[PDB]
Structure 1
Amino acid sequence: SMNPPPPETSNPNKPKRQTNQLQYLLRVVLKTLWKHQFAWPFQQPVDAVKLNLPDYYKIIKTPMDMGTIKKRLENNYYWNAQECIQDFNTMFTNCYIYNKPGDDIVLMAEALEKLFLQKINELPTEE
């Protein structure tokens, strides 16, 4: 099998803006999730070849991961905060689609997802 190319992270033709929400998403939400003990399986795309998961990208057609989200924020890929939040949600959902209740990775996703909701809770207001 093969991995797909990673999701796009920097589009120089898209318009760019810096908002308090986008800065919060990178410096508070992402950063705190990134440094969690269980972040490491979510910091880059699932390498289905190295992990020997030949069905991964047969089942998961909208892959996402925190490495991609990080790069997207750093490169102003997101205009709206909701695009970023959607990517996080996609990342977690993928995990629950592919994996079984009680799997280590599922428990790790639950931890990160709880912490995510804690942090988005205090997201600054929209301009």
Structure 2
Amino acid sequence: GSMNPPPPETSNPNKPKRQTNQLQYLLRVVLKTLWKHQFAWPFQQPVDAVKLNLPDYYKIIKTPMDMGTIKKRLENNYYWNAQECIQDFNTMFTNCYIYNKPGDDIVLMAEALEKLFLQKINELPT
């Protein structure tokens, strides 16, 4: 039998909170721009491997990540360091490359989203 894992942790009220220029930009500019992209829809929520009939997905992908989780982590002050958020974006793209094969449609879609991501964090404020 095949079940999805619970989604990643997005909220811990015991974690210290800070507002930074970089976390605000990651939510208001970067997340916003990737969310509205033509290719965002597969990445907006956890992979539902039951719904998609892919019982091997959570056999291969042990560090799941998606933009819906990253949005909640940003808005709930889950991240202390901007690099934690940048790591989650990179995990989301590399999961797609790990599960799938070079040249697959979803890989071309993730590669384009990654290119936009790198252009947006090129302008990460200081």
TM-score, normalised with respect to structure 1: 0.97
User: How far 1:99 sits from its partner (Å)?
Assistant: 0.4
Equivalent-residue separation in structure 1 for 2:100 and 2:21 (angstroms): 35
User: How far 1:42 sits from its partner (Å)?
Assistant: 0.3
What secondary structure, in the 3-state scheme, does the structure 1 residue paired with 2:50 have?
coil
**Which residue pairs with 1:97 in the alignment?**
98
Equivalent-residue separation in structure 2 for 1:89 and 1:102 (angstroms): 19
User: How far 1:100 sits from its partner (Å)?
Assistant: 1.1
Equivalent-residue separation in structure 2 for 1:30 and 1:112 (angstroms): 11
User: How far 1:102 sits from its partner (Å)?
Assistant: 1.7
Identity of aligned residues (%): 100
Cα deviation code 1:78-115 (max 9, x no counterpart): 00000000000000000000001121110110110000
User: How far 1:73 sits from its partner (Å)?
Assistant: 0.2
CA RMSD in angstroms comes to 0.5
User: How far 1:19 sits from its partner (Å)?
Assistant: 0.6
Q: Which runs of 4+ in 1 moved over 4 A?
A: none
Cα deviation code 1:25-84 (max 9, x no counterpart): 000011100000000000000000000110000000000000000000000000000000
Equivalent-residue separation in structure 2 for 1:124 and 1:22 (angstroms): 10
100-109 or 44-53, larger mean C-alpha shift = 100-109
Give ranges in structure 2 of 5+ residues lacking alignment.
none
What are the equivalent positions in structure 2 for 1:10-89 lying under 5 Å apart? 10-89=11-90
The alignment of Structure 1 onto Structure 2 pairs a total of residues equal to 125
